[PDB]
RNA sequence: CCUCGGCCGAUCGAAAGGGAGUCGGGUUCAGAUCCCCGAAUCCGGAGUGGCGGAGAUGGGCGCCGCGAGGCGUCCAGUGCGGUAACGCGACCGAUCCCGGAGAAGCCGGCGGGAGCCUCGGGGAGAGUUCUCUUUUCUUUGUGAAGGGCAGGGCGCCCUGGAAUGGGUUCGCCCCGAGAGAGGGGCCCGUGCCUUGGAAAGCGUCGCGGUUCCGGCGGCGUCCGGUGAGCUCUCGCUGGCCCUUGAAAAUCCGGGGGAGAGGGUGUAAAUCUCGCGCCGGGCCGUACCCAUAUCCGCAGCAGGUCUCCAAGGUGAACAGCC
RNA sequence: CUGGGCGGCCGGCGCCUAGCAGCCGACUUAGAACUGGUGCGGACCAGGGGAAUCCGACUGUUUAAUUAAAACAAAGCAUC
């Protein structure tokens with residue numbers, strides 16, 4: 189598993205043709221966006237809910253999205 | 258601590274007094290550290306029989322079984338120098 | 347007396363260019379506040395030209411007569427002074443101590459020492475400076 | 482106190498059966514089999530007792546999946562010789578060659594004058 | 596057809612020697628690091644370039660462009676930084692040569708890390724309450740592989756020049772062949788945080804359907820202190836030896852420079868860097884492992900190689916509970 | 917272990933100096949009083965000793981299934 193610290197890098201990873209799904213998890217302190225690729229599961233940790241809702245809207249179309257509720 | 262046994266006190270009474278006395282001289286010389294003639298530091302220990310090593314300049318020298326220099330070696334080295342000098346001059 | 351004058355050939359004892367031959371451009375026997383030890387700015391050869399024989403063509407000789415250079419400051423303790431001396435007129439305004447703060451200027455100092463060395467190499471003088479030390 | 486068992490069919494405390502204790506997310510203690518400790522390269526000079534610097538101490542077969550920078554130092558005789566003996570051979574090569582030129586000149590001048 | 600070229604000879608020989616690379620959770624009547632879920636990894640292949648990044652895109656002479664920035668010509672460019680130790684994501688190269696790792700005894704003494712034990716509190720459940728005891732018992736996680744930081748080690752470097760000798764260990768031991776002091780560098784990092792990760796596991800309290808839903812939900816999975824303690828492991832440093840404690844596959848680094856590439860393109864050869872695509876065949880695997888699955892005519896007080904190892908007493912892996 | 921004249925600090929103005937104050941902590945040793953029907957390493961664990969003689973120097977080994985010994989080996993000595 190790889191940890192990505194930039195939103196721009198996360199969008200690049202999500203738009204890879206290798207990417208299979210985006211799993212959003214909500215915790216008590218942060219929201220984690222996980223993109224599953226061939227080799228690594230890339231996780232982005234966001235501590236602001238305002239930026240979290242923005243990322244959901246900007247997620248690439250067609251890519252499967254699962255909410256871990 | 259001891260009167261006369263010295264280093265061969267590790268053998269107790271287990272061998273003869275004369276055998277312990279003879280090995281006393283050899284065991285002192287075989288475990289002593291000598292001054293290295295190459296670097297000048299007193300670190301010339303014995304690796305094995307006939308092998309002497311310096312732990313500072315990392316020089317290994319062929320020497321005696323228990324002493325660094327045998328008397329036969331010193332005489333031969335001095336004699337070879339005399340024979341070489343006679344050949345040259 | 348002193349012998350670490352400009353023009354002397356030195357052997358680099360440490361670093362990347364360990365074993366390479368260089369020439370003292372400027373010498374600072376005292377300590378600058380930046381570096382309190384004695385040091386010298388040198389220009390040297392990173393890649394020596396390859397040997398050329400009468401059997402090679404002109405294009406091959408030209409391609410094999412190319413020099414890669416380096417410009418550095420060295421502690422004297424990392425230099426081995428040599429009796430040999432090379433008087434190449436390196437432009438002092440291009441080869442300076444200030445060349446190290448700016449990458450662009452470093453390329454200028456590298457290119458100038460490169461060009462001068464190629465001219466001196468082709469003329470056949472200072473044969474020792476352009477041979478690679480075999481160690 | 483929980484007691485452990487081997488995870489493999491080798492029941493002997495050999496050099497290839499070394500293990501360590503790890504606590505799992507299931508709150509259980511299990512054995513993890515450990516790799517042998519690697520050693521960094523020893524200098525080609527033959528006189529330096531210590532290992533070389535700047536090279537990873539790994540087992541030899543893993544060495545082929547590392548990059549070259551992890552296996553060498555940026556210097557002549559980089560990942561095979563120490564800096565101290567590389568310095569000594571630069572000076573030893575230069576000074577012996579200097580003596581050879583001096584000897585040749587001395588014997589040439591002596592021959593010419595005699 | 597030239598050039599190179601020693602097999603210092605076939606082959607067999609270890610389910611405890613060497614030998615790349617997997618670990619958490621769940622699942623059976625009986626399997627499981629092998630099945631399912633999840634997260635990784637090694638080796639091999641990719642020719643007809645899989646995509647990026649690197650190589651590798653500068654300088655001089657002028658002209659136009661208000662000037663920026665473009666047109667022509669010429670010359671470079673097989674990377675770069677640090678005084679150094681060495682560092683950075685790659686950073687061409689054959690025959691040949693040198694070296695390393697694999698690859699080394701036994702014993703002792705110290706130190707680091709972990710597991711276990713211990714002590715003080717906070718939760719949840721349970722036991723006792725004839726009298727006391729704010730008590731007694733249980734339980735109170737974060738795999739590999741990456742990233743960062745502690746911590747340990749260093750005969751690694753730079754300044755500098757020490758006697759009124761100093762530094763220092765339990766012991767030693769160290770220094771003009773460079774002490775102490777200051778500042779750096781490297782290796783290991785099994786520890787901590789982090790991605791994995793709480794979604795899972797466990798504890799406890801409830802609500803469902805029906806024999807099973809990895810059902811659903813609430814709360815929690817906390818804060819500290821100790822030590823010549825035991826075990827494992829990593830280090831450092833010694834003692835002993837007329838005893839010096841494997842070999843080979845396999846992998847890597849260096850020396851050299853025979854070669855290859857392209858003339859200024861937005862380019863070439865090349866790349867041990869990042870990601871992407873395909874594959875990994877054959878055999879073993881149940882269970883006993885012994886006062887009943889083995890040998891001794893048997894369920895025979897005999898024999899048969901190992902691993903883990905709690906509390907109290909106490910020198911103890913003694914005996915006793 | 918920490919400290920030494922809202923938060924800092926430009927400063928003479930302070931002087932920690934028979935090591936002072938506060939906080940933290942584990943394991944022992946020695947001495948004393950008292951006390952029991954002198955019983956207490958209370959179980960468990962756990963050498964009887966001395967004077968001599970013979971043989972072998974010692975450690976080691978041996979007839980598995982009647983002999984563990986003074987037998988064998990051993991270092992040392994000597995000979996070929």
Ligand SMILES: [Zn+2]
Pocket residue numbers: 293294295296297298311312313314315316
């Ligand atoms: Zn010496």
